[PDB]
Design a protein around this ligand. Structure first.
Ligand SMILES: OC[C@H]1O[C@@H](O[C@@H]2[C@@H](O)[C@H](O[C@@H]3[C@@H](O)[C@H](O)O[C@H](CO)[C@H]3O)O[C@H](CO)[C@H]2O)[C@H](O)[C@@H](O)[C@@H]1O
Ligand SMILES: OC[C@H]1O[C@@H](O[C@@H]2[C@@H](O)[C@H](O[C@@H]3[C@@H](O)[C@H](O)O[C@H](CO)[C@H]3O)O[C@H](CO)[C@H]2O)[C@H](O)[C@@H](O)[C@@H]1O
Length: 549
């Protein structure tokens, strides 16, 4: 019944080197999207292989930009892919929900500026120059994520609080502020936490590059990279990348108007899913219960579950690849927003795991939204490679009860790996880990700002809920480069007992932990459990623990 392939729709703007007035067209999109933080418009900018001149592609909200070559250098800009913070007067901490992928950049002054905060991935890029991650003026910034990229020159974070880079090559790295973490990065600074705060791993235990749309001659296909174990450096640096190409006609091209019934029928009939840029309400969960199904979003394609349903349920199958989607809570509380595997799921998926990549979750902000637990990861061996799970702290429909969301991520599966984990503002535990042999490389949290009083976050005999909790029953766990920040601005007398909570066991280990009070608005009593100094003063100095236990 469901037909594969077809037109990508009016929200995918496709350019070729002969297209007239590319700069004008990209500027038109930017003018509309620059300060459109919570609007429903969505755009994907796609560039056919070739060389583009005189281009400064400024990237606003809900805008993806990418090349369509098999390799990044197939699509080269003499010019820039720019994010700056002019619209927010130099403050980059709301520069969300945008992306760059699969381009080579020759920046006009020798340095490309990508001054982003959360949910702004930078993947499979070749920067023939330096990369500045800070807004002009060096104002506030809270990114960030680079994967599978080569920066010929220096990456300069400047004011960036923290950053995660994996499986990349850099010519240099300028500085660290609170938490700069690296895994598999050629050219990374050596391990040196706490000063500078560099957490450096020689390899990434497992990684699998995100699938992406490209052109094979004149035919659209999706490239599906093969997994790497103990990954280091780029996947494409040595020519022909390992992987499979799926023709576009094997994808159901989802466009505004599609129902979950039709989307589900497509997967049952053997089609993959390509979500064109838009906002999709569903009255029942999208169910992906076929092995190796790709569900790929363009232009920050967004799913809103109506009637309190779960937005996305992946079955107990190998190799599902969910990529580039925003799940946006409806005002009716959803018990869960995303489920990976069934409750009690018991099989292994080690050779061909399921992954979530550039999957973002929002609760509130564009109107009231509620969910009890945002992502539940049941399936063993699942890879979570860049997520931002965010209870809104600002916008419309925000409040301690108005956009209540108790739990961010709950990992129940075994051998689950999170690389680039960003989870913020939940009323209770932002992350809870119940499964065995979990690993997290890079964590960024901020606690809820709007707790009205101490009683509101009382957790048995503990003040507050950890940002990252490993259940007492767990035997093996390991985390690297992890920070939790507080800003109790509604009630700055509040105390948060710790950022992290875990059993004290030989196989449960942490490296380079920190907690930070932002401007003395509340304080931490400890870093992890009852260990580590409290934060003090109003000067935003981190409290650190190098090794636990
Ligand atoms: O010419 C290439 C050059 O482009 C720069 O992109 C700039 C923006 O940085 C600049 O942003 C301004 C902010 O810095 C300032 O804080 O506020 C004002 C007003 O909102 C902003 O305009 O805006 C211009 C367009 O007006 C862009 O061209 C890149 O940052 C830089 O890396 C690159 O070399
Ligand atoms: O509220 C918008 C956005 O805020 C993000 O967190 C910001 C912090 O990034 C910011 O941190 C400042 C540091 O960047 C700077 O170096 O030091 C100052 C103190 O001198 C810090 O305040 O602080 C503000 C509060 O003032 C926070 O809101 C969140 O990560 C994000 O979720 C949120 O949407």
């Amino acid at each position: 019944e469901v037909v594969g392939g077809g037109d990508l729709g009016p929200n995918v703007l496709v350019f070729d080197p002969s297209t007239p007035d590319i700069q004008g067209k990209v500027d038109e999109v930017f003018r509309k999207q620059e300060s459109n933080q919570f609007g429903t418009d969505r755009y994907a900018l796609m560039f056919k292989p070739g060389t583009y001149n005189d281009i400064n592609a400024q990237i606003g909200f809900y805008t993806s930009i990418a090349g369509l070559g098999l390799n990044p250098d197939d699509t080269t800009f003499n010019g820039d892919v720019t994010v700056d913070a002019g619209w927010f007067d130099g403050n980059a901490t709301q520069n969300f929900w945008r992306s760059a992928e699969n381009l080579a950049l020759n920046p006009v002054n020798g340095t490309n500026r990508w001054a982003v905060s959360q949910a702004a991935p930078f993947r499979r890029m070749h920067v023939k120059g330096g990369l500045n991650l800070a807004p002009d003026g060096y104002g506030w910034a809270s990114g960030g994520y680079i994967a599978d990229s080569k920066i010929d020159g220096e990456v300069g974070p400047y004011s960036q609080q923290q950053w995660y880079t994996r499986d990349s090559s850099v010519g240099g790295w300028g500085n660290g502020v609170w938490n700069m973490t690296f895994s598999g990065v050629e050219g990374a600074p050596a391990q040196s936490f706490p000063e500078p705060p560099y957490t450096t791993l020689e390899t990434t235990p497992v990684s699998r590059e995100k699938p992406f749309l490209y052109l094979d001659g004149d035919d659209y296909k999706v490239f599906v990279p093969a997994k790497r174990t103990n990954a280091r450096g780029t996947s494409w640096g040595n020519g022909t990348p390992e992987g499979e190409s799926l023709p576009l006609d094997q994808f159901y091209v989802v466009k505004p108007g599609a129902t979950a019934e039709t989307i589900n029928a497509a997967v049952d009939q053997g089609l993959h899913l390509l979500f064109t840029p838009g906002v999709y309400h569903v009255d029942q969960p999208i169910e992906i219960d076929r092995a190796n199904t790709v569900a790929l979003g363009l232009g920050l394609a967004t799913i809103i579950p109506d009637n309190g349903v779960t937005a996305l349920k992946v079955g107990d199958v190998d190799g599902v690849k969910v990529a580039g989607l925003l799940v946006d809570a409806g005002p009716v509380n959803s018990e869960t927003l995303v489920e990976v595997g069934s409750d009690g799921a018991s099989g292994d998926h080690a050779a061909n795991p399921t992954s979530l990549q550039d999957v973002f979750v929002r609760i509130g902000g564009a109107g009231p939204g509620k969910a009890t637990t945002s992502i539940v990861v049941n399936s063993n061996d699942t890879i979570i490679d860049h997520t931002w799970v965010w209870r809104a702290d600002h916008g419309e429909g925000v409040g301690w009860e108005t956009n209540r969301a108790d739990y961010g991520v709950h990992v129940k599966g075994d051998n689950v790996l999170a690389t680039g984990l960003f989870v913020e503002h939940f009323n209770k535990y932002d992350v809870q880990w119940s499964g065995e042999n979990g690993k997290t490389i890079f964590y960024q949290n901020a606690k809820a700002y709007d707790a009205p009083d101490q009683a509101a976050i009382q957790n048995g005999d503990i003040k507050g809920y950890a940002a990252y909790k490993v259940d007492d029953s767990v035997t093996t766990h390991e985390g690297w480069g992890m920070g939790s920040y507080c800003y109790f601005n509604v009630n700055p007398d509040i105390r948060q007992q710790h950022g992290f909570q875990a059993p004290v066991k030989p196989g449960v280990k942490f490296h380079d932990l920190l907690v930070v009070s932002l401007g003395g608005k509340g304080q931490y009593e400890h870093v992890i459990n009852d260990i580590g100094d409290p934060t003090s003063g109003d000067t935003t100095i981190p409290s650190q623990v190098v090794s636990f236990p």
